[PDB]
Amino acid sequence: APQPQPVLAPLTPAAVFLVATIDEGQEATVYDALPDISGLVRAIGFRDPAKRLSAITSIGSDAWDRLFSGPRPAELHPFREIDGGRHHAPATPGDLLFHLRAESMDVCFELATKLVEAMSGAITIVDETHGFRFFDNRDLMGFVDGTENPDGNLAVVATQIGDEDPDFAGGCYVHVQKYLHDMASWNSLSVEEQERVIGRTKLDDIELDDDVKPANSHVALNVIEDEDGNELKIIRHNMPFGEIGKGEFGTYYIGYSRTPSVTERMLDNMFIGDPPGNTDRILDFSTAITGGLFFTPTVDFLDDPPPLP
Amino acid sequence: APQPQPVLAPLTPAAVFLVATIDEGQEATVYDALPDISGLVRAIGFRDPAKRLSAITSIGSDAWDRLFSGPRPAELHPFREIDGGRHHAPATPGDLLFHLRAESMDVCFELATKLVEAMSGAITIVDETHGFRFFDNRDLMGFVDGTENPDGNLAVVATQIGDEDPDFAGGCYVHVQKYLHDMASWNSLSVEEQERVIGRTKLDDIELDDDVKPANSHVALNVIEDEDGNELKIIRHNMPFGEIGKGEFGTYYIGYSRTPSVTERMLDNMFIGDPPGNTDRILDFSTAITGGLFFTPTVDFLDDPPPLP
Amino acid sequence: APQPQPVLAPLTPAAVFLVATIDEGQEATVYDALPDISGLVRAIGFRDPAKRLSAITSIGSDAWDRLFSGPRPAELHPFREIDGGRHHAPATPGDLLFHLRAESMDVCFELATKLVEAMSGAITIVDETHGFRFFDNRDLMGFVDGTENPDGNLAVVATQIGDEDPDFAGGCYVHVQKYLHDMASWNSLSVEEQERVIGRTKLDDIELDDDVKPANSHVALNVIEDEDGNELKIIRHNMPFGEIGKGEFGTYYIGYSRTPSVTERMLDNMFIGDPPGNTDRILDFSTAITGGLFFTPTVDFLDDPPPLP
Amino acid sequence: APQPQPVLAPLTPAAVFLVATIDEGQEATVYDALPDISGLVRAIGFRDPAKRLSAITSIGSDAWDRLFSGPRPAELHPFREIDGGRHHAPATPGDLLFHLRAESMDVCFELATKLVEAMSGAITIVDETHGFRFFDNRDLMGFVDGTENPDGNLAVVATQIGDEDPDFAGGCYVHVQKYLHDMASWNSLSVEEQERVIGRTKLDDIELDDDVKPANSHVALNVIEDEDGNELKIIRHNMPFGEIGKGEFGTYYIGYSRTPSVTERMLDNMFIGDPPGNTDRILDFSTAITGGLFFTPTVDFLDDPPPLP
């Protein structure tokens, strides 16, 4: 009966990520537009319903204490800035996240055009990226991106909250991280070295052998084993963006998870690293620019918001 | 026998316009990359040949006097800045124009990635727009854009130079104009007022009646009659762009023509206007930001450049 | 007025190559079916005309002296077996070549089913390959295959015979070579070594720098300069095939050209090699299995065959 | 008449590098042992004089301001820690450097045993490496190490100070850098990739062609041209060391030069890199652990030290 937000969707060829911060004293203006979002999605994306326009509304901690009364999600907190040994993961202020995805750029652009002008003057858009998609789902590093997202049962228990928090049954936690990795050192780097970085191959994306794969690789550090033996997986819709006029080539990481402890332990395996391997090899090239922790509610939660405190 | 550049191509769902100015003393570096462009196009766009990756290399006046010896195109000059009564059409310095077009954003992005890094350090990219495409070829104004481009004979004699300049048989002239029209006044404006602006309808794009269409409309001012009775047409691949994080909603106008006198008389009918109607009604909302006049050579001209002076 | 055979067609996702030798005393049986081929093509491929079923009938030297009277193509001869220093290019007997190409496998299969059973008992099919097509037009080596085929004027003068032989104005010469290259040594070989083999990159297929590209590379040896300065190009529809049950991974090379001297000089640059570089680096891995020289006539030539001698 | 320290010696099969820091208030204790060093060398190495035991005493900046009065070497300063884009060159505190070299390990060990116990309690040995020597002067990377050291006149003007500083006529400057490069990524890397790293071949150590050698290679970045056209060379006795019990495989770099500007420009060409090539390819695998800048005096300077301030 709790219908979740469309996070369990395939990767789309175009995507728009909006991190908009809410201005002071503009609470009821966003409280108007928050039930209107699914109406705008069904209004716009029904023009070409075979484009699969799907918005993912997400709300941070500050916007939760401002906008909503009653309960609170249990692990919803501001994104812990990870000041590691060499690489730092910053956290810019962002109240709400609009994650838009469809088959083409225009319908995402029009949904975002109608989104901020349903709450005109209430928000300033802090982060504006138009994430496109490479040839066979690659990123700017050249490796195929996101091939280990689960499906079915191993995905809905990976993302959707059950009754471990029954007031928010259904709903995820989001970690956006806008990277801006350089290509000057990455392109001069040889392929095999880059497979040491990633942990899988580049052309065919075969995972490397367990003894051949180094301990500080990305696919080596990001898989998390529990003590019972099961592995905890997240679903990430990482879409590359970039502007050649500034020479920017970045991959907008965005990870959906049942609890932010899993994503934060992955980020601890990357930035803080393992106690053997204290650095992740992709962070030698990728520097995070933005950061934020958010919460997806259900679409019923946007349909029936709790009253404004 | 002169093969022209692929200007006679249909409008593609994604486009990248690059206006890069050449740095001082970096002439031979661009002279290396200028024969390499068609090779890079055939190299990249053959991956998915049903995406129709097509670059249009264009060269301004300064880059012609720097890069090429021998002859000169007859009407190639810097873009005359039109300081009208109220609206001004500026002209930023830009040496060469890279016009890229294909079915998706990624292959245009990768061709542009390989374009500046075939001449690394020789250029600074002044203007960086990623032109996407609306639902049924619309622009951000809401009207269907570019429905009066000719086809066949009325297009090749509209764009390709014959032997009126036999040293450049085949080849066009380009007028880029990056507009940044506001949507706050345009959206509050009513539809029939906007059809007085355009001159055609909005939903179905029927051209209005000749008596009903006002004299200061866009479609009224831009059609040019000659004294023999024939009309001179240009081919324009106007692609909308925009950034909602700045609130920008612009249409990157780009017009290909056999001679820049035709495009300049259209711009005189818009900015300077008719002596009856001195203003074009779309310029009440559209303010030009950039501007430039360029020259398309043949692909044989890039294959066989004249020697560097 | 001479309509050529559909050789100037884009690469299709499926292809069937048939090298059938004609049995002794079965001349008039093939002489029946040879005007019927375009009728069968228009009959079958009109079911889904957006599959682009296109047959290329080709005739060798023996089938020309048997089947046709009157003139002879000037350079039509049996395929000269190249016994180089280490690699040998054999020539199995094959009278006629059926080159079939369309968007799917089934309509090529049905055209080939109707082709041999229009001349039932007259031929034995010596070589039977079902050439499929990789992701972005790649081959089994992993490199994008066939990205330097010309288009337009530089293709029709590359393939179609003018009036240098006016009795066969329009028409090409075909060099089939069924390779069976091993993947055990190629996969263990590193990427940059393979880019020394090919001469272009692997992921993005950028051609290498002229000083960086070695002299014994494939793209280095196969480009042919003339003494006037023009380069002679051929059009090749190389389609990969293979059978994993035998561990076969081969690329069916097939090259169309205006004269077989160009293709034979390319094969001399590969097998015999340059006098500096006597071996082509791809022939370290690719061993030719079959070989044949054929002639495409016009479709008018199949419509109006010369009388049977 | 100024006899220099034995820096102009061939590479020996065993070497001991000692970086010992002087304790506070133990100045006169080292001032006792500093004239005794050549006496200990002639005392121990005369047992088997065909082992060529040769110590190179070196003194840093802090030990110069503590131990010696009067003048100062002109460019003697603490080793500037190079915090590049990705690779950092640290500088641990080390007052004096004992560089020992002979045909076998034992006589170097005994000279070092008598060296610290001639100044017992005055020093703590910060860095203790026993540099052995590979098959044909190789290092752990597998390449032959140090084959471009000059000889004769081009070596004595490369190392020994003339009267550009006449108070220290004869004498060098030392840059020690204890690397700890990993072998897991280097061994999985292929040979030709490693020759792109080094710039010379691996088995026979032929220098590569000037166009074939990449710009970010080690031998490409470390050769320094002046504006007059002469090249500045240093002499380096790089000896490999290592401990397999920790999995350490390192090459103790130690470079002797007439002025530290040359060695520091080489380190700037490596870590900071060229403005085209900002990284040296061997620094992808080699991470510096220690670092220090020292000064070799003459042996007459140890025989006649200036009075203790």
Ligand code: HEM
């Ligand atoms: C710096 C930007 C990043 C890039 C370019 C990147 C790219 C990749 C690539 C290419 C793979 C291998 C293909 C696949 O399995 O997805 C991968 C794996 C993965 N990435 Fe990322 N990634 C980035 C950051 C992150 C972050 C910040 C997280 C989470 C905190 C993350 C989570 C994962 C996970 C969980 C895997 C799969 C591990 C396994 O297969 O179980 N990535 N990433």
Ligand code: HEM
């Ligand atoms: C300010 C940005 C502009 C916008 C949004 C715009 C949009 C449009 C639209 C919607 C139409 C009607 C549909 C069609 O016929 O194309 C049109 C017509 C046209 N536009 Fe534009 N346009 C712009 C600027 C220009 C400029 C700067 C030129 C040339 C100097 C130009 C040349 C034309 C021409 C020639 C026509 C067709 C007139 C006729 O049908 O013969 N436009 N434009």
Ligand code: HEM
């Ligand atoms: C052994 C099987 C072969 C394979 C796997 C193969 C594959 C390739 C590949 C990957 C390229 C680079 C991409 C492109 O430009 O096409 C290439 C180039 C080429 N191949 Fe082949 N090829 C083979 C045999 C041949 C043969 C037998 C000929 C002709 C006698 C030939 C003619 C060419 C030509 C003319 C080029 C382009 C050179 C230039 O760009 O001007 N190939 N081939």
Ligand code: HEM
């Ligand atoms: C990271 C550890 C290093 C290793 C394993 C290493 C090894 C090598 C090797 C194998 C060569 C080529 C053979 C020969 O010419 O010597 C070489 C060349 C050279 N190395 Fe190093 N090296 C290292 C660091 C350094 C450093 C830190 C410097 C000086 C700042 C340096 C200075 C040179 C010079 C000047 C050359 C010769 C360039 C030319 O031939 O003119 N090396 N090194």
